[PDB]
Amino acid sequence: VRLPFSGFRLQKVLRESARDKIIFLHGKVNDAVVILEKTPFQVEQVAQLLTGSPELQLQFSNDIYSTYHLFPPRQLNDVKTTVVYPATEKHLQKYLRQDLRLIRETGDDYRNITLPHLESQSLSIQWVYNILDKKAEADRIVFENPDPSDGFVLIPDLKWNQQQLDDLYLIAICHRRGIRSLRDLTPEHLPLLRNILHQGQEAILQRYRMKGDHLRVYLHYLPSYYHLHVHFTALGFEAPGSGVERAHLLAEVIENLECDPRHYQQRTLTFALRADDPLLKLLQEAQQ
Amino acid sequence: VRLPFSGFRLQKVLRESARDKIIFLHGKVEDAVVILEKTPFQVEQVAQLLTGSPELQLQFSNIYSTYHLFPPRQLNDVKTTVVYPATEKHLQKYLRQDLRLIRETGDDYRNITLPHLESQSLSIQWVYNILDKKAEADRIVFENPDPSDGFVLIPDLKWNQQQLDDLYLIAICHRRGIRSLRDLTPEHLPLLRNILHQGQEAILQRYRMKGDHLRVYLHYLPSYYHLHVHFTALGFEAPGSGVERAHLLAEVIENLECDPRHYQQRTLTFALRADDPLLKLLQEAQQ
Numbered sequence: 001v002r003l004p005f006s007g008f009r010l011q012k013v014l015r016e017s018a019r020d021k022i023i024f025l026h027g028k029v030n031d032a033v034v035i036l037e038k039t040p041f042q043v044e045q046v047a048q049l050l051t052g053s054p055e056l057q058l059q060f061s062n063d064i065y066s067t068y069h070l071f072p073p074r075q076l077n078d079v080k081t082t083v084v085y086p087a088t089e090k091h092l093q094k095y096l097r098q099d100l101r102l103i104r105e106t107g108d109d110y111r112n113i114t115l116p117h118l119e120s121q122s123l124s125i126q127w128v129y130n131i132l133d134k135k136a137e138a139d140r141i142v143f144e145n146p147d148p149s150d151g152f153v154l155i156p157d158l159k160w161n162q163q164q165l166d167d168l169y170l171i172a173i174c175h176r177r178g179i180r181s182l183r184d185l186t187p188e189h190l191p192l193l194r195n196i197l198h199q200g201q202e203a204i205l206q207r208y209r210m211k212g213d214h215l216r217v218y219l220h221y222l223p224s225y226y227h228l229h230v231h232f233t234a235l236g237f238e239a240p241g242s243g244v245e246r247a248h249l250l251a252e253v254i255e256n257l258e259c260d261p262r263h264y265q266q267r268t269l270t271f272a273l274r275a276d277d278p279l280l281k282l283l284q285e286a287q288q
Numbered sequence: 289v290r291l292p293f294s295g296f297r298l299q300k301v302l303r304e305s306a307r308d309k310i311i312f313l314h315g316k317v318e319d320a321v322v323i324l325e326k327t328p329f330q331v332e333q334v335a336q337l338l339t340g341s342p343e344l345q346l347q348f349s350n351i352y353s354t355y356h357l358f359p360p361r362q363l364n365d366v367k368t369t370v371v372y373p374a375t376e377k378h379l380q381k382y383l384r385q386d387l388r389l390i391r392e393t394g395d396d397y398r399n400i401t402l403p404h405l406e407s408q409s410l411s412i413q414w415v416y417n418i419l420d421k422k423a424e425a426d427r428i429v430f431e432n433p434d435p436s437d438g439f440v441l442i443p444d445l446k447w448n449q450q451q452l453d454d455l456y457l458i459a460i461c462h463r464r465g466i467r468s469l470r471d472l473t474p475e476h477l478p479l480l481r482n483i484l485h486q487g488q489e490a491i492l493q494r495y496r497m498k499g500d501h502l503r504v505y506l507h508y509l510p511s512y513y514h515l516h517v518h519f520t521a522l523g524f525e526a527p528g529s530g531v532e533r534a535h536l537l538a539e540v541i542e543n544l545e546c547d548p549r550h551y552q553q554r555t556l557t558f559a560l561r562a563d564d565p566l567l568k569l570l571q572e573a574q575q
């Protein structure tokens with residue numbers, strides 16, 4: 001009916017979504033958070049104003065094409081205003097999205113900069129180890145090829161509620177300890193990868209009756225943790241990770257290693273890093 | 289101003305993405321396709337209305353409370369893209385058919401895809417008109433007018449230019465004839481390095497946006513068969529940044545440098561509409 005407080009004072013923009021037409025804003029009042037979402041169109045309201053005389057402003061016109069800047073009446077001007085009053089730092093945390101900067105890492109950049117940095121920051125992958133030795137999430141196992149070397153475990157991702165196929169997000173993990181990232185891959189890793197590709201998709205087609213042509217099979221680089229795991233997502237589903245600056249198709253990771261054996265050891269890989277991430281500056285610096 | 293024609297008569301709705309806040313509509317006027325996109329917010333025009341007295345209508349209250357808001361004219365902008373006239377080829381590209389992934393080997397292109405595309409793809413003419421400065425001439429941000437190794441940097445139709453967040457620009461090569469990523473040989477290497485570096489530098493001058501904030505990719509399979517390079521803002525969830533379509537210019541160059549016959553022989557992955565006939569031609573060639 002109005003405002004919960006008295007006046008807003010914009011401090012920082014928590015999150016942004018230009019694709020989704022939404023804005024997330026933090027503000028001090030009398031702390032609180034305000035969210036604005038541009039409402040999606042209504043078939044009837046739009047068609048009705050179209051057959052009439054609307055306000056149009058020509059941006060440009062080339063060939064059969066032409067764009068306009070439009071201003072519709074009150075009924076089509078709705079915006080979703082979600083207000084969270086009050087809010088704290090444990091809410092600013094999982095609701096703010098940081099700046100992203102792209103970096104191109106040479107064969108040598110990894111060897112001499114990235115890898116020694118990663119060796120410094122003691123990462124715990126005990127949760128993975130526990131999944132592999134069936135100590136944890138044992139029930140969720142969809143498939144397992146228990147070969148110690150060429151073997152893997154196919155489990156559905158934890159955020160997938162498994163109530164629909166549309167958002168199918170499964171994640172395989174190789175049994176062989178030691179493969180940190182996509183950079184540790186040599187032709188000796190080729191059979192373990194082919195099993196994860198074909199054996200995984202077949203486990204999926206048996207358990208979920210989902211054909212290979214409906215599946216995106218990719219690897220992340222730089223990954224969230226350093227122990228080779230492959231993503232298996234439903235094709236129609238678009239979820240941060242399918243982005244060209246991070247995803248590497250298993251189909252091609254295999255075709256590449258088949259052609260150039262030393263490929264992922266020497267070839268320059270592109271990925272983004274958080275502005276706050278210290279590694280980003282270490283590479284920016286090594287490259288000047 | 290008003291529409292290019294006289295009155296609209298809605299036929300069918302091509303696409304309606306509630307997540308993207310966009311509507312695709314077909315209407316007889318002859319034929320005409322109209323697209324409406326709810327414009328993404330602008331830091332300033334939002335912050336300014338916030339410190340004031342806005343129109344709010346309580347939907348619900350928990351401490352979770354939602355409101356229905358009505359902002360002034362400036363914040364009421366909608367992107368109205370009109371295609372007049374719209375052929376049956378326009379009326380199919382914009383529908384929503386189930387996506388199926390396909391892997392094209394070197395020979396699959398040579399023997400199946402390429403002869404299909406030669407049968408007919410799309411009218412380029414809008415591109416030609418931009419390149420010959422017949423159209424959108426003023427909007428050109430950059431040009432290296434070399435006939436072979438030259439290009440043109442113009443911002444995308446899919447960009448209102450009112451914010452950096454959704455930055456979408458293009459780099460159309462001046463050299464007519466390069467259809468897709470598959471037409472690329474070492475002779476096109478200087479042409480690409482020109483669109484890589486020269487492009488980013490025309491962006492950093494006009495928009496003061498550093499290279500580290502930019503996604504420079506190529507599409508495969510593309511919307512039109514005449515080599516064009518996408519230049520998108522990194523934070524922007526750009527429709528086309530998907531691994532099953534995008535190819536980073538940085539790497540297209542690196543792969544060409546290594547294997548000269550790379551994009552002519554190497555197996556490329558891309559998705560196709562269930563309705564797309566090419567999809568079936570490859571599915572069939574592979575059985």
Ligand SMILES: *S(=O)(=O)c1cccc(COc2cccc3nc(N)nc(N)c23)c1
Nearest residue numbers: 062065378414442443444445446511512
């Ligand atoms: S059309 O069917 O709407 C279509 C088919 C294939 C590709 C496109 C690309 O977008 C444009 C078309 C015409 C003009 C234009 N001008 C500029 N500067 N950028 C773009 N991106 C387009 C449309």
